[PDB]
Structure formats: structure tokens, C-alpha cells
């Protein structure tokens, strides 16, 4: 068989994310289902703004923290082993991964 498969990956520090994606992409085609290679999605900037005190009298000073979510997907078509294989290596830090069957 062949099954149309979508892998989404969402996570943070870049250079790791980028080379997880690299790897899914390169082994994907390399034994060529041929992807639909990493679609980089606009990275999401969570912003929090607070006064630096806990608690106030003082030049009003402000701090803003971010948390930057990065998303990608990659489109595979196959089956059995190369599915659960290609997902599961490609594993470790900091990396959410979801795989979706097809259509709806």
C-alpha cells in the first residue's frame, strides 16, 4: 500500500528544529516518497509584559518576555515501516510531533 500522511512538528530552539526537519525531509525523498518538503509556518511570538517590581514605587520599568513557537509540516506517502520508522527516529529534544491519516 500507500497512505497519504501529514507530519506536523511544532517546537522551539531553531537549529535543532531545523535539522529535525532537514532529516525528515532528506530521508523522506532520499528514499523517495519525495515529501512536499518542510513548510515553514510563521513562527509565533508569545509576549508577556510586566512591571519589574513585584510591587511598585519606582521608575515605572517594563519587562517583556517572549516564548517563540515554531511550526513545520512535511507530506509523506507510504506505508507500514517507513511510517513508524521515519517518525520515531527523528527523535529527542524539545519537539512535538503529530502524524495525521488523511483527508478530514
Amino acid at each position: 500500500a500507500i497512505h497519504r500522511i501529514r507530519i506536523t512538528l511544532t517546537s522551539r530552539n531553531v537549529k535543532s528544529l531545523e535539522k529535525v526537519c532537514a532529516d525528515l525531509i532528506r530521508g523522506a525523498k532520499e528514499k523517495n516518497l519525495k515529501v512536499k518538503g518542510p513548510v515553514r509556518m510563521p513562527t509565533k511570538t508569545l509576549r508577556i509584559t510586566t512591571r519589574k517590581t513585584p510591587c511598585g514605587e519606582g521608575s515605572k520599568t517594563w519587562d517583556r518576555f517572549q516564548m517563540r513557537i515554531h511550526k513545520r509540516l512535511i507530506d509523506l506517502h507510504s506505508p507500514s515501516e517507513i511510517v513508524k520508522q521515519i517518525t520515531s527516529i527523528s527523535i529527542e529534544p524539545g519537539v512535538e510531533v503529530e502524524v495525521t491519516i488523511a483527508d478530514a
Binding site: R12, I48, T50, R51, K52, P54, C55, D63, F65, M67
Partner: protein, 53 residues
């Protein structure tokens, strides 16, 4: 049993706190974090909120 002992807690300041510290004041409710600002300052590193600019 004591029908006596509660009045609505559904909404307002009184309906929420700090998952960290009980405080019903200065509460960060964005992104569902629900931490008071004083605490959030101390835990923003372990949550994944880092200073960049």
C-alpha cells in the same frame, strides 16, 4: 450539608488565583498560564519565557 458556607465563585477576581501562590492580585491570565506576576517573574525561565529584547 451546611447549605450555609458559599456564594457564587464563577467569575471575577474572586473566581481565580495563582496556581503557584493563591494570590488573587495581578494575575497573568494570558495563554492560560494563570500565574501572578510576582511568581511568573520567578518561574518564567522554567516555563520557557526568555528575555530577548
Amino acid at each position: 450539608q451546611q447549605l450555609y458556607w458559599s456564594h457564587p465563585r464563577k467569575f471575577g477576581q474572586g473566581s481565580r488565583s495563582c496556581r503557584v501562590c493563591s494570590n488573587r492580585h495581578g494575575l497573568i491570565r494570558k495563554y492560560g498560564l494563570n500565574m501572578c506576576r510576582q511568581c511568573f517573574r520567578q518561574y518564567a525561565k522554567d516555563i520557557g519565557f526568555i528575555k530577548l529584547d
